[PDB]
Write a protein that binds this ligand. Structure first.
Ligand SMILES: Nc1nc2oc3ccc(C4CCC(F)(F)CC4)cc3c(=O)c2cc1C(=O)O
Length: 604
């Protein structure tokens, strides 16, 4: 049994969304077979609907046609089908439990801004903008395309409306943290009066408010949480956009013009991957393609506290000199796995990766379909976070090995250039100390030898202290990079995939418990499968956390502690080689004062 139209038909079982106004079924066309989103209302229109047909934009669900159902003669809207679901469906997946991927987050902000801007050009106010109103379609290139459609909700209401840019800030915060900005203890339900008190608390610059105890305080914060998977350079640019659109004061609200301007400023910036080799931290510099390298070094300082003049950059196994006027679009293309390593002559503290240390929540024995579903969602998102951090720690070590194996070659290049200047001074020394012996009033020559022999003696001390450094940059010479290959984790250990196997099992059990919650009750047979897999959900999470801490973190902290020592020994050798090379330049000119002095007397 199902309803039909002159051109479309849909099964009642293939129901998509169920709302107060209407329900949307997944239907097909009678003549083509193409899938459409059919909207059948349960219960002026002929004009406001045809004006929504001509609305053609990439970030707007196309309203194809308006037809009348056969049996009930109900107005039916034929809308574009979005097989991936809504943004809320995307945020329900455990991989996005603590925030969307950074690239996926930029697609959301681009489509949402690009969609409402087209709606403002036509003059349509959305009133309610939530992840449920933002559909997801896969584009012809494989990247997601987000669209608006339903043009509210309790959690996304303005404080004055609780009694337009507000719900947009709550959506972006939810998409970036994987959680809501203003959450009471027992959730926005019976603590609804607390939720209103949280919004009327208007801390202006702060964007979050977590009541971690029943009827307790409200933990405010102006920055994003540590679990946020966005880069630190993106949080710096995203925080002021939200804080200025999350306060009830229309006097202090931004409006769409300043909002669209500052958001367009973020999307027009290219990414330059920079890995602080001495701090063992990866960064992303959001810089416009027309900015100079001077502003680039400014952003590197604001993210690493490294002075611009001391920033020495490495790329693809060679040094990199950035001209202060070289535009950012002419920089070499960088990835997360091939960045621009930054090193400095000043000593830098070795920090590593900073992440939120979360433990497994306890599993309850109560057979509750809703409880087991909400429990399986949180515990699977925790393993996704630990699986995310594990791959980030592996990347940090692999980036560390390349940056160290490169930096030793860059130092061996500085050593070989010192040898070139040494051979220039040795050749000049010999051809001037012996050209005097050939010609050889006594004080004018004896003073030279007491000075030439002092040069050849101090020049030789450079040679001995140089071949010592050549012995230090040799294999096993108290500075080899062999320990990096024998300390932390490696892709050969396959630790990220060992955690990803247990993650898929936990996600399948989660998706099954998500189906088991839709069914109001289960049969005795299906009930014990739900209980048996609920116990396997704990054994999988316990096996993952054990392998994560007792292998991934221990090897990482052993590699990090070994890295902090090798950095000191490397900074010490760089100061010696620099002094020894400066001791070759000042004596290169000291032999320039004597090569022309007495060797060229005056006589007619
Ligand atoms: N045009 C629209 N297309 C829509 O396609 C959809 C396609 C698939 C799904 C499922 C959602 C939850 C799940 F079952 F677990 C996995 C897939 C939902 C929708 C949907 O909700 C929708 C709404 C509209 C609208 O305009 O409201």
């Amino acid at each position: 049994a199902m309803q039909s139209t002159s051109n479309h038909l849909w099964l009642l079982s293939d129901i998509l969304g169920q709302g107060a106004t209407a329900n949307v079924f997944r239907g097909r066309h009678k003549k083509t077979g193409d899938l459409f989103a059919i909207k059948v209302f349960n219960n002026v229109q002929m004009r406001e609907f045809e004006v929504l047909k001509k609305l053609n934009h990439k970030n707007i669900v196309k309203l194809f046609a308006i037809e009348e159902e056969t049996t009930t003669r109900h107005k039916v809207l034929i809308m574009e089908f979005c097989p991936c679901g809504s943004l809320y469906t995307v945020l329900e997946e455990p991989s996005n439990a603590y925030g969307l991927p950074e690239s996926e987050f930029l697609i959301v902000l681009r489509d949402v801004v690009g969609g409402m801007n087209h709606l403002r050009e036509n003059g349509i106010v959305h009133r309610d903008i939530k992840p449920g109103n933002i559909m997801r379609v896969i584009g012809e290139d494989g990247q997601s395309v987000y669209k608006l459609t339903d043009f509210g909700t309790e959690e996304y209401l303005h404080p004055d409306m609780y009694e337009d840019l507000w719900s947009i800030g709550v959506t972006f915060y939810h998409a970036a943290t994987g959680s809501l900005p203003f959450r009471p203890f027992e959730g926005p339900r019976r603590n609804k009066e607390v939720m209103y008190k949280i919004i009327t608390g208007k801390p202006s610059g702060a964007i979050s408010g977590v009541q971690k105890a029943e009827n307790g305080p409200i933990d405010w914060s102006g920055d994003m949480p540590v679990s946020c998977s966005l880069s630190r350079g993106l949080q710096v640019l995203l925080t002021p956009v939200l804080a200025n659109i999350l306060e009830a004061d229309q006097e202090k609200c931004w409006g769409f013009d300043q909002f669209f301007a500052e958001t367009s400023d973020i999307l027009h910036r290219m990414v330059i991957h920079v890995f602080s080799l001495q701090q063992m931290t990866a960064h992303k510099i959001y810089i416009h393609s027309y900015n100079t390298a001077t502003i680039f070094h400014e952003l590197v300082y604001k993210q690493t506290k490294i002075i611009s003049s001391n920033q020495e950059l490495i790329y693809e196994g060679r040094r990199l000199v950035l001209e202060p006027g070289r535009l950012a679009q002419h920089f070499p293309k960088t990835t997360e796995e091939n960045p621009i390593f930054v090193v400095s002559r000043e000593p830098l503290n070795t920090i590593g990766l900073i992440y939120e240390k979360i433990s497994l929540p306890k599993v309850h024995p109560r057979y509750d379909l809703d409880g087991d579903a909400s429990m399986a969602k949180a515990i699977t998102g925790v393993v996704c976070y630990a699986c995310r951090i594990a791959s980030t720690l592996l990347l940090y070590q692999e980036l560390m090995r390349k940056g160290i194996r490169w930096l030793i070659e860059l130092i061996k290049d500085d050593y070989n250039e010192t040898v070139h200047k040494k051979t220039e001074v040795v050749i000049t020394l010999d051809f001037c100390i012996r050209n005097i012996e050939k010609t050889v009033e006594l004080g004018e020559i004896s003073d030279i030898h007491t000075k030439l022999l002092r040069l050849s003696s101090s020049q030789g001390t450079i040679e001995t202290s140089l071949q010592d450094i050549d012995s230090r940059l040799s294999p096993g010479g108290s500075l080899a990079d062999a320990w990096a290959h024998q300390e932390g984790t490696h892709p050969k250990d396959r630790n990220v995939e060992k955690l990803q196997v247990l993650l898929n099992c936990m996600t399948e059990i989660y998706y099954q418990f998500k189906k088991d919650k839709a069914e109001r009750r289960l049969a005795y047979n299906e009930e014990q499968i739900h209980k048996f897999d609920k116990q396997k959900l704990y054994y999988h999470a316990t096996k993952a956390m054990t392998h994560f801490t007792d292998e991934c973190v221990k090897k990482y902290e052993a590699f990090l502690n070994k890295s902090e020592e090798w950095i000191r020994k490397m900074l010490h050798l760089r100061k010696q080689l620099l002094s020894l090379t400066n001791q070759c330049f000042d004596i290169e000119e000291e032999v320039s004062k004597y090569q022309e002095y007495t060797n060229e007397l005056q006589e007619t």
